[PDB]
Structure formats: C-alpha cells, structure tokens
Amino acid sequence: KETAAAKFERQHMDSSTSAASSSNYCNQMMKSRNLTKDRCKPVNTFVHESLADVQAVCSQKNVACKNGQTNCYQSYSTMSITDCRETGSSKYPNCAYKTTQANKHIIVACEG
C-alpha cells in the first residue's frame, strides 16, 4: 500500500513550479494527484519547494500539532505554498477549488 511518506509527497509536494500560475492550479492539481477520487477533499495545501527542504523540517522547531500530538515541527523559514479550498460550486465529481498563493511557515507531523 502507499506509504504515509509517499502519500505526503503526492498530496502536498509540487517542486515543479515556484507558485500557482493561474486560477486553475487547484482544480488541475487536486484532480491529477487523485485527491478527488472518492470525494472532494475540502482543503489541501501544496508546497513549492524541494523535497529535501521539506524533509529537513523534521529536524527544525518541535511544536504541538493542532490536535495536541507532540511530533509536529515548524519550518524555520517561510515557504512558497498554494492553498486549495473548495468553492460553493464544488459538487462531486466536479470538485471545484479556489487557488490562494502564499509564503508562510509550514507545520508538519513527522514519523520514523
């Protein structure tokens, strides 16, 4: 089965672009990454950085996850990210998203 690490890359990594290039980015990426297969994932974030840079977050600032778990880490640096959020017109299987470009610190959960 797909590993949790591999699932992370598929759902959130986009090292081939520096940032979302058009309003259609979310629509295209959510579809192509198979995130809309069973239902419309309501929210999703893509990171436009090298995988190594994102993997290094696991050795940066240790913080509590939103749910209280203690294996979260916050990037020391801000990263180029794209926020994908479902639109009022979204209706499975024609999932629709609004694309929002940003530069912020990311918080990931790490395992090993």
Partner: peptide, 11 residues
C-alpha cells in the same frame, strides 16, 4: 529516517 507524514498547518 524521520520524514513528514501529515501537513498540519501554515503559519
């Protein structure tokens, strides 16, 4: 190795 398995939030 210790790698990211979940995206928790952007701050």
């Amino acid at each position: 190795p210790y790698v990211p398995v979940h995206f928790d939030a952007s701050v």
